[PDB]
Amino acid sequence: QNYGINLPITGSMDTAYANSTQEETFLTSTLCLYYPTEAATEINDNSWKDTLSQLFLTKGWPTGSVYFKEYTDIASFSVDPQLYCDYNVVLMKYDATLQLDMSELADLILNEWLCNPMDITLYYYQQTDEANKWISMGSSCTIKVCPLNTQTLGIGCLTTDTATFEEVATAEKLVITDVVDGVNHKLDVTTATCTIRNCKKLGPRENVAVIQVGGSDVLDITADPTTAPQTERMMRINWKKWWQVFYTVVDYVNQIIQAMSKRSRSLNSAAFYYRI
Amino acid sequence: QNYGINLPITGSMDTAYANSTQEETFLTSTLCLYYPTEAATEINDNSWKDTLSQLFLTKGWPTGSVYFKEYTDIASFSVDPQLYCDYNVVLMKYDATLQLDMSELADLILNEWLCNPMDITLYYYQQTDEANKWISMGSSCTIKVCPLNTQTLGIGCLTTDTATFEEVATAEKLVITDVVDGVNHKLDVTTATCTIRNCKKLGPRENVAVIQVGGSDVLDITADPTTAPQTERMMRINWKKWWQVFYTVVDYVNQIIQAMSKRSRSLNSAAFYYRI
Amino acid sequence: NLPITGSMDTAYANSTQEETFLTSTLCLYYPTEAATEINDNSWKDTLSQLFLTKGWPTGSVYFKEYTDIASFSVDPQLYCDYNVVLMKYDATLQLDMSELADLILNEWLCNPMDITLYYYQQTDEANKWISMGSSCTIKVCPLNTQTLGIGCLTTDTATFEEVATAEKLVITDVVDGVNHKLDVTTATCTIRNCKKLGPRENVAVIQVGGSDVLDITADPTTAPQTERMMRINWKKWWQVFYTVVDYVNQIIQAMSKRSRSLNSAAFYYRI
Amino acid sequence: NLPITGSMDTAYANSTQEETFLTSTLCLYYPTEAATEINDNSWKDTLSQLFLTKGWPTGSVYFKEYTDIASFSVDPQLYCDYNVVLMKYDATLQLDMSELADLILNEWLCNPMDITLYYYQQTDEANKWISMGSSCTIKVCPLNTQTLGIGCLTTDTATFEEVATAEKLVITDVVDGVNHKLDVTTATCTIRNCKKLGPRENVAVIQVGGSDVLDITADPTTAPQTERMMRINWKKWWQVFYTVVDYVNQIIQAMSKRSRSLNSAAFYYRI
Amino acid sequence: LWKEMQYNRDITIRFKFASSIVKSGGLGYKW
Ligand SMILES: *[C@@H]1O[C@H](CO)[C@@H](O)[C@H](O)[C@H]1NC(C)=O
Ligand SMILES: *[C@@H]1O[C@H](CO)[C@@H](O)[C@H](O)[C@H]1NC(C)=O
Ligand SMILES: [Ca+2]
Ligand SMILES: [Ca+2]
Ligand SMILES: [Ca+2]
Ligand SMILES: [Ca+2]
Ligand SMILES: [Ca+2]
Ligand SMILES: [Ca+2]
Ligand SMILES: [Ca+2]
Ligand SMILES: [Ca+2]
Ligand SMILES: [Ca+2]
Ligand SMILES: [Ca+2]
Ligand SMILES: [Ca+2]
Ligand SMILES: [Ca+2]
Ligand SMILES: [Ca+2]
Ligand SMILES: [Ca+2]
Ligand SMILES: [Ca+2]
Ligand SMILES: [Ca+2]
């Protein structure tokens, strides 16, 4: 009821009545499975979604609670991903050639980002703090950056000559750019086929889990070199058949949800903080 | 926060007022101006955005905080309108032939909405409360509704023959349908061209101000026939040239934003929260 | 009409809305173009069923149709206990809209006028001359204390001052305390000397599209916009009727029972 | 409905006859032959002025014409606060006129009878089947627990028992507690299951000529003549209307306000 | 949870029987 203020909450370390009902999640919340198209291709069954809904329903999820979403590949899915279910699971296939991209994708969906517009034509841009990044999405994002000095002149570049700009992204569907903080930069971006946004990392996105189907642990959702955290929402499974992957997902869906929490930004409690 | 949302906040009626925070609010916020294309056409200048930024800076905005978004017309802008900045000001040109549309646009962007998908092909749909509406937007949305009875039989319409359904919207970029509550309706919509959602009005937005350029007080942001509230965020001005309008907006940005409040910008830029 | 003494602690009674709907009736007036656009032969029945979903028993809602504002203005009879008039806004008919709203939203005590025999004057601001018919053309000739025309000739009716031409309803307001000779086409329109007693609380007017232009008071200094004068935006008439049905609770809440004792036995509906 | 405690020592209030005449409406129903024999286009105004001499304000008295008893019996709509039906006596129509009286001198709570799909029965002596239309030909087939018919075959309407033929109005009374199959011409008839609640006090019937033959109760052991069933001998209709006008106070005395809260759809002529 | 929805429908059952007539041997006097 009191929405704009952070009030302390007091609790007793000896409090009784530790009741629970995970069933509340199943009947009230919805589950979304994001998988690559090649998974559906390999399965090659026209009613596999129905069978998976049946199997999930064995786990308590009423029919219609579980949704299945298809994406062609990691790069295509990275273009402004929209995860709307209460609980989101993304089966991301591992590609040794697309490590950073996968990381970027995870960094976009495993975290919470507050993004403002960028008018590269009008304004020069800095990155105020460690949480400030420049996230660009589109069909082909090509970002070139020219750092300036206190006199507004470029460093190793000419503001009036884009050929000297230091390219940092080339034909990217999604790219998160991290530059030196406290330095103004002139940005050249393909605005026709790419939108760039000035984003702040508020914190984890609790209700999004990524299951890496394949190779070893490579995701780096933190721009800081010294730390490469592996949060509980970053699962990894070895695979040879996609039916096996989906059966493992269904059989252990309870643990997958247990690793996740309701999106703290998506409930009435967070009203008038940023969103609902 | 969430655990202390339902807690009292006590304040003495003698606590000293704090110094003005408008300066810091401008220094820490971003402003978005939404204007029609005819505005830029009449201005007939390329550097006008830069000049407006400089004038806003003269009014106390750091270079980089003011952004200008251009939309073709009211109808096109009504399709999934996006509110990017902390403060949003929408300059709606008044046309006597689009009153409802204007209201609809206002109703969408001056209020918070909570929306759900509508599989009109598989379910009948009710509107449970006066706050429940059906917001549909797209390239061209044509909504036909058949009110059923307690026996799941159309009233004044054949449930199988769409030609007998009732026309409530034809070729609409945006429409907010309100049907009788407690009645199950069978819906047929141009799903290929538009998306329809079951939405609940949660309250005002407080960070979107609509300035109506020309005309009279015609906006009705409440479907209730016996109320046409004129909130502080819906303003009206008279005009002969667009440069005067923009100068008025710049010179009275303090007053315009004094009627708006931060803390309401959602993490997503969309005009409604979505729950699938 | 006796004094009523009440305490400031008497418990509120339950909602009378349910029994009010069960024991009253609603007349809904719409233009012909509404039915034309609806293009359904049973829309009255489905609207009645929707109202029943809202509470009103079947047959309690009466749907009356008028060609347009001007035709409706010719002696409009309101039957049901609660009347809601859907008036479509036309930018060129503002005064006619205002006159219709004045006539049906207020209570008038009228007596006949003999323009061909006696001079007439208006006693106070509540006194007007309401003329209605197929075609009303009223010309006025004010008279001085010597019963002689001012800016007009008593014998010559051409010199009279034209205040109405071909109107189907017109509320004429002249300077009070001055005698006027009236030239009115009595063959095609009747004029009556009327006094405004107060508001008609059982008649609401919903203005479909437009702006707040109604002026139900002749005073230049007041444009009340009472709670019984609603306005909505529209593109399709079905949406308008659905909005009327859904919020009928609020519409009736804005209205009250007529509460006037009439000396004329007219045709009404009263369940 | 609450208990009403009164004192036997209270003083009689003054005559309310003038007040009720001023604030109520009177409806007179007469056959077309009355207007034919009178042969005067202004007779309505003459009777109105005579009533005004009796006290009724001009316009409160409404005159309604019906072709004959058979035609009037098709959904008789009684508008005014006080209704007086001048019913010409015909020795051949003794039942029909009686039925009409039974329909208008009593309050009936009616519901639809969808015979073609449902089996119907009468639960008590107050239950009847009122059928009205242009031609009501009702055939009845009593049934038993095994659903078979008694002296009738449910599949052969020719064996159904004939209870009415070409009737504009008929009140059917069958044996209670027994299911019947009904075959009536729904195209030109509508049959309703009705319960008589009590007398309808605002409707009086004046039988013009004949003798007391009305039987408004199906029970053979009762043929009561209430104060609302008058009978006058006649040779001229002008005399009939003069005696109705002169004794209007007596006629209204025999009548009381309706007092029933209805749910049906009927217009009224009220002041 | 579950919702109750009503369906009262006016149906017309049109049906018929079939006959199996298997005749015995001989000259055809016996079925
Ligand atoms: C607030 O304003 C007052 C007067 O303008 C000024 O003296 C003071 O330093 C400001 N800050 C605080 C913390 O009081
Ligand atoms: C009743 O009638 C009496 C005698 O005619 C008269 O004195 C009195 O004023 C009347 N009214 C009342 C209220 O008693
Ligand atoms: Ca360089
Ligand atoms: Ca990338
Ligand atoms: Ca940085
Ligand atoms: Ca790292
Ligand atoms: Ca629209
Ligand atoms: Ca229809
Ligand atoms: Ca509704
Ligand atoms: Ca409204
Ligand atoms: Ca007029
Ligand atoms: Ca003159
Ligand atoms: Ca005057
Ligand atoms: Ca005025
Ligand atoms: Ca009969
Ligand atoms: Ca028989
Ligand atoms: Ca019986
Ligand atoms: Ca009897």
CB D28 within 8 A of CB D44: no
Cβ neighbours, 10 Å, residue B217 = 13
From residue C207, give the alpha-carbon distance in Å to each of A63, B28, B99, C137, C232.
Answer: 47, 45, 13, 27, 6
CB C256 within 8 A of CB C199: no
Burial of D200 (0-12, 13-18, 19+ CB in 10 A): buried
Residue B256 parent element (H or E)? helix B253-258
Q: Which of C58, C263, C265 sits opposite D269 (nearest CB)?
A: C265
Which residues, 6 or more positions from C15, have their beta carbon under 8 angstroms from its beta carbon?
none
Which chain E positions have a beta carbon within 8 Å of B152's beta carbon? 5-7
- Span between the terminal Cα atoms of chain A, in Å: 12
Among C135, C141, C179, C146, smallest CA distance to C157 is for C141
SS3 D85: strand
Q: Give per-residue burial for A79-88: e unless 16+ CB within 10 Å, then b.
A: eebebbbbbb
From the CA of D166, the nearest ligand is 15
Compute the nearest-CA separation of C65 from chain D (Å): 17
Residue B105 parent element (H or E)? helix B99-109
Q: E residues 2-31 near B, CB within 8 Å?
A: 5-8
As a whole number of angstroms, the distance between CA B200 and CA B134 comes to 9
Output the six-digit token pair for A237: 């499974």
As a whole number of angstroms, the distance between CA C132 and CA C104 comes to 13
SS3 C7: coil
Residue C66 parent element (H or E)? strand C61-66
Burial of C86 (0-12, 13-18, 19+ CB in 10 A): buried
C42 with B156: Cβ contact below 8 A: yes
CB C70 within 8 A of CB C169: yes
As a whole number of angstroms, the distance between CA A129 and CA A179 comes to 10
Using DSSP, how many helices (H) and how many strands (E) does chain E show? Answer: 0, 0
CA B110 to chain centre: 4
Amino acid identity at A12? S
Interchain CB contacts (distance < 8 Å): A and B: 84
As a whole number of angstroms, the distance between CA A268 and CA A4 comes to 11
As a whole number of angstroms, the distance between CA A201 and CA A113 comes to 5
C59 with D262: Cβ contact below 8 A: no
From the CA of B132, the nearest ligand is 9
How many residues are given for chain C?
271
- In chain D, which ranges are E strands? 26-31, 61-66, 82-88, 106-112, 127-136, 138-142, 161-162, 167-172, 180-184, 189-199, 203-208, 229-232, 267-270
CA of B179 to the centre of ligand 7 (A): 16
As a whole number of angstroms, the distance between CA B111 and CA B109 comes to 6
Annotated binding site of D for Ca(2+): 40, 122, 151, 159, 161, 173-174, 176, 246
A134 lies within 8 A of chain B by CB: no
DSSP state of C149: B
CA B231 to chain centre: 13
SS3 C178: coil
Place of tokens 């019947």: D180
* C163 marked as binding residue: no
Cβ neighbours, 10 Å, residue B185 = 24
Cβ neighbours, 10 Å, residue C166 = 13
CB D180 within 8 A of CB D174: yes
SS3 C234: coil
As a whole number of angstroms, the distance between CA A235 and CA A260 comes to 11
CB B213 within 8 A of CB B237: yes
Amino acid identity at B17? Y
B128 lies within 8 A of chain E by CB: no
CB C70 within 8 A of CB C168: yes
CB C169 within 8 A of CB C145: no
B168 with C242: Cβ contact below 8 A: yes
* B178 marked as binding residue: yes
Burial of E5 (0-12, 13-18, 19+ CB in 10 A): exposed
From residue B217, give the alpha-carbon distance in Å to each of A173, C231, D4.
Answer: 45, 11, 57
Compute the nearest-CA separation of A67 from chain B (Å): 9
From residue B71, give the alpha-carbon distance in Å to each of B30, B77, B102.
Answer: 19, 6, 14
Which is it for strands C138-143 and C161-162: parallel, antiparallel or unpaired?
A: antiparallel
Angle separating helix axes D43-54 and D237-246, nearest 10 degrees? 20
CA A209 to chain centre: 9
SS3 A134: strand
CA of D191 to the centre of ligand 17 (A): 15
As a whole number of angstroms, the distance between CA A205 and CA A199 comes to 15
Which is it for strands D26-31 and B31-36: parallel, antiparallel or unpaired?
A: unpaired
CB C208 within 8 A of CB C86: yes
DSSP state of C10: P
Residue B48 parent element (H or E)? helix B48-58
Which residues, 6 or more positions from A138, have their beta carbon under 8 angstroms from its beta carbon?
A79, A173, A190, A193, A194, A195
CB C176 within 8 A of CB C124: yes
Which residues, 6 or more positions from D27, have their beta carbon under 8 angstroms from its beta carbon?
D61, D62, D63, D64, D78, D79, D80, D82, D83, D84, D269
- In the structure, ligand 16 is a single-atom ion and the residues with CB under 5 Å from it are D 151-152, 159
What phi and psi, each to the nearest 5 degrees, are found at residue A245?
-60, -45
What phi and psi, each to the nearest 5 degrees, are found at residue A32?
-125, 130
Compute the nearest-CA separation of B149 from chain E (Å): 10
Place of tokens 């003794």: D94
Chains that touch C (3 or more CB pairs under 8 A): B, D
SS (H, E, C) D116-147: CCCCECCCCCCEEEEEEEEEECEEEEEECCCC
Amino acid identity at A108? L
As a whole number of angstroms, the distance between CA D63 and CA C125 comes to 40
How many residues are given for chain D?
271
Among B202, B200, B162, B166, smallest CA distance to B181 is for B200
DSSP state of A158: B
B160 lies within 8 A of chain E by CB: no
How many residues are given for chain A?
276
Amino acid identity at A236? R
Among B114, B60, B48, smallest CA distance to B87 is for B60
Give just the sign of the alpha carbon dihedral C211, C217, C220, C225: negative
B67 with A117: Cβ contact below 8 A: yes
As a whole number of angstroms, the distance between CA C270 and CA D261 comes to 10
SS (H, E, C) D10-54: CCCCCCCHHHHHHHCCEEEEEEHHHHHHHCCCCHHHHHHHHHHHH
Q: Give per-residue burial for A45-61: e unless 16+ CB within 10 Å, then b.
A: eeebbeebbebbbeeeb
As a whole number of angstroms, the distance between CA A40 and CA D96 comes to 80
Which residues, 6 or more positions from C155, have their beta carbon under 8 angstroms from its beta carbon?
none
* C246 marked as binding residue: yes
CB B220 within 8 A of CB B103: yes
Region label for A229, one of left (φ > 0), alpha (ψ between -120 and 50) or beta (otherwise):
beta
B223 lies within 8 A of chain C by CB: yes
Among C214, C215, C155, smallest CA distance to C181 is for C155
CB D267 within 8 A of CB C79: yes
As a whole number of angstroms, the distance between CA D226 and CA D96 comes to 18
How many residues are given for chain E?
31
CB B31 within 8 A of CB B67: yes
From residue D120, give the alpha-carbon distance in Å to each of C152, D149, D173, D183, D208.
Answer: 80, 13, 12, 11, 38
As a whole number of angstroms, the distance between CA C124 and CA C193 comes to 12
As a whole number of angstroms, the distance between CA E21 and CA B27 comes to 100
Tell me how the structure was determined: cryo-EM
Interchain CB contacts (distance < 8 Å): B and E: 7
* H-only helix segments in chain A: 23-28, 37-43, 48-58, 74-77, 99-109, 242-251, 253-258
C53 with B225: Cβ contact below 8 A: no
Contact: chain A with chain D (3+ CB pairs below 8 Å): no
CA C36 to chain centre: 24
Cβ neighbours, 10 Å, residue D173 = 13
Which is it for strands B166-177 and B87-93: parallel, antiparallel or unpaired?
A: unpaired
CA of C260 to the centre of ligand 2 (A): 25
SS3 C246: helix
From the CA of D149, the nearest ligand is 16
Task: Find residue C269's DSSP bridge partners.
Answer: D267
As a whole number of angstroms, the distance between CA B61 and CA B22 comes to 10
As a whole number of angstroms, the distance between CA C99 and CA C170 comes to 7
SS3 C173: coil
Which is it for strands B194-204 and B185-189: parallel, antiparallel or unpaired?
A: unpaired
**Nearest residue of C to residue D19 by CA position?**
C263
As a whole number of angstroms, the distance between CA D97 and CA D81 comes to 22
* B230 marked as binding residue: no
As a whole number of angstroms, the distance between CA C26 and CA D101 comes to 32
Contact: chain C with chain B (3+ CB pairs below 8 Å): yes
E8 with B151: Cβ contact below 8 A: yes
Q: Which of A6, A84, A86 sits opposite B1 (nearest CB)?
A: A6
Q: Give per-residue burial for C18-55: e unless 16+ CB within 10 Å, then b.
A: eebbebbbbbbbbbeebbeebebeebbebbbbbbbbbb
A7 with B9: Cβ contact below 8 A: yes
CA A2 to chain centre: 30
Apex D260 CA angle, D257 and D262, nearest 5: 130
CA of B229 to the centre of ligand 10 (A): 8
Give just the sign of the alpha carbon dihedral B223, B227, B228, B233: negative
**Nearest residue of C to residue B228 by CA position?**
C231
Q: C residues 18-77 near D, CB within 8 Å?
A: 22-23, 57-60
Interchain CB contacts (distance < 8 Å): B and C: 91
CA of C204 to the centre of ligand 17 (A): 49
B150 with E7: Cβ contact below 8 A: no
CA of C266 to the centre of ligand 17 (A): 41
CB D28 within 8 A of CB D72: no
SS3 D156: strand
Long-range CB contacts (within 8 A, 24+) of B164-171: B166/C40, B166/C238, B167/B142, B167/B143, B167/C236, B167/C238, B168/B143, B168/B144, B168/C236, B168/C238, B168/C239, B168/C242, B169/B136, B169/B141, B169/B142, B169/B143, B169/C235, B169/C236, B169/C239, B170/B142, B170/C236, B171/B140, B171/B141, B171/B142
**Nearest residue of D to residue C261 by CA position?**
D271
As a whole number of angstroms, the distance between CA A107 and CA D56 comes to 90
As a whole number of angstroms, the distance between CA B107 and CA B90 comes to 13
Which residues, 6 or more positions from E23, have their beta carbon under 8 angstroms from its beta carbon?
E30, E31
**Nearest residue of C to residue B104 by CA position?**
C233
As a whole number of angstroms, the distance between CA B192 and CA B141 comes to 9
Output the six-digit token pair for D158: 């020719």
CB B176 within 8 A of CB C243: no
Among B134, B165, B177, smallest CA distance to C43 is for B165
